[model samples]
Target: GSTAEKDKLPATQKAKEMQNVPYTIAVDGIMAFNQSYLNLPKDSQLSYLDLGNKVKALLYDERGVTPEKIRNAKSAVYTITWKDGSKKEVDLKKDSYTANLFDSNSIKQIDINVKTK
Candidate 1:
């Protein structure tokens, strides 16, 4: 049924008469991990040795630690997804790893999904 009476109501009054909308989170904006590293750049563009240290700094910023603890993670690596939709994998085991992460291509995201045997 149609009625002109419904057309004259103010938005607030109409809203008062309507059913409530459900709340939700946008899936595309969330990460599998609790913290969002989406804002951090893929590479800091430092020298091979420096990039590793930068990653260590990011870890310390997220969770406090000592330099020795950073050294212990020398074998750690990152799976990076770049803004141009390219993927690059880098391992901190070698000081040369950062060379691949320089200027031209930049990372869009990274994850700590290390593999274990």
Candidate 2:
């Protein structure tokens, strides 16, 4: 025997897909890192701008940038979750953007992951 509950809608039965997935992941990593700036003493402390550029420098290893070559470097990763309960990742180059990222209505959230040490 079953409970006295009645049946609700049999089903909406609608399937969907996630588009414009970002290639980068863990974009939030920099926030916590910024706190470490204050970890230094009064004089040892540096400006946020200084720390910002210094961190940027660490990601620089240089692939190639001569007239006959192109320069490329991996900066951080961008991970995005979708309303469809799916996720994707991308290790972004020094300068990059997501083409499919126009519709914020599609993205649930993003996490920027960077490497440091």
Candidate 3:
């Protein structure tokens, strides 16, 4: 439209979405913004306005998937210790409890054994 719609976005929001990020919903999630309204295709960038979602936001809007565990909006980084003493790092931002090994922290090490029966 015009400056009206443009100015509605806060400086932070504008700044966040201004960068062109090629994000797509996992190939299987249902449409959020246009399921009963319009028929916007999946896995496609309808427009810059298509980013009206956080993981929880999308889950809620798309499939009525409300939050079950986590109770806040926070970004976190975690290091996972395998049972075999090996390590893997996960860097993700999330709002809900998506099943993790550690909550969020750095550790010198944690004893683990990594052999499947």
Candidate 4:
């Protein structure tokens, strides 16, 4: 049914809910590798080298010596539709490998229960 509340979720979350398992965004391969480069301008190509240099200059030098870790300031959300056809929402924030969230639909800070899922 198109009016069902769960069909609106993305495919990955749908897969997870159907299989009753958690799949790493990293193991998803294509989506993982593309995360560092996604949402950029279509005509512009920025290499890992360019981005690394920028990170080094901005985060390492300006901040301090940091550990060999991935720094991500964004979130990944998974919306699940169960076999019984109910909806579930999960939000992953401040993760190193997922960004460009699909839930920033709020216009004001008061938090009205809009369709942010």
* lDDT (0 to 1) per candidate: 0.45, 0.39, 0.32, 0.30
- The runs of at least 3 residues in candidate 1 whose Cα sits more than 4 Å from the true structure, single-residue gaps closed, are 1-32, 35-54, 94-101, 113-117
**2 against 3, candidate with superior TM-score:** 2
The lDDT-based order of candidates, best leading, equals 1, 2, 3, 4
Q: What are the TM-scores, per candidate, against the unseen true structure? A: 0.43, 0.33, 0.21, 0.21
Task: Give one digit per residue, the lDDT tens place, for model 4 in 1-115.
Answer: 7778876787654322211122112212222222121122222334434523543443343335342322332333434333354554444343245433211111111100111
lDDT of model 2 at residue 33?
24
Q: Is candidate 1 or candidate 4 better by lDDT?
A: 1
Stretches of model 4 off by over 4 angstroms after superposition: 1-44, 67-117
TM-score of 4: 0.21
Q: Could you say which candidate leads in lDDT? A: 1
Off by over 4 Å in 2: 1-75, 94-98
RMSD of each: 12.9, 17.2, 16.4, 18.6
What lDDT score is found at residue 113 in candidate 2?
Answer: 63
Candidate 2 steric clashes = 15
Residues 8-104, model 3: lDDT tens digits: 7665443222222121222122321232222223333332124223334644554454343222224233334433556664433432444432221
Could you give candidate 2's per-residue lDDT for residues 1-117 as a string of tens digits? 366555742655346532332222222243322212111122233332453343343233221223112122234554557657676775654535534322345445444465432
Clashes of each: 0, 15, 5, 0
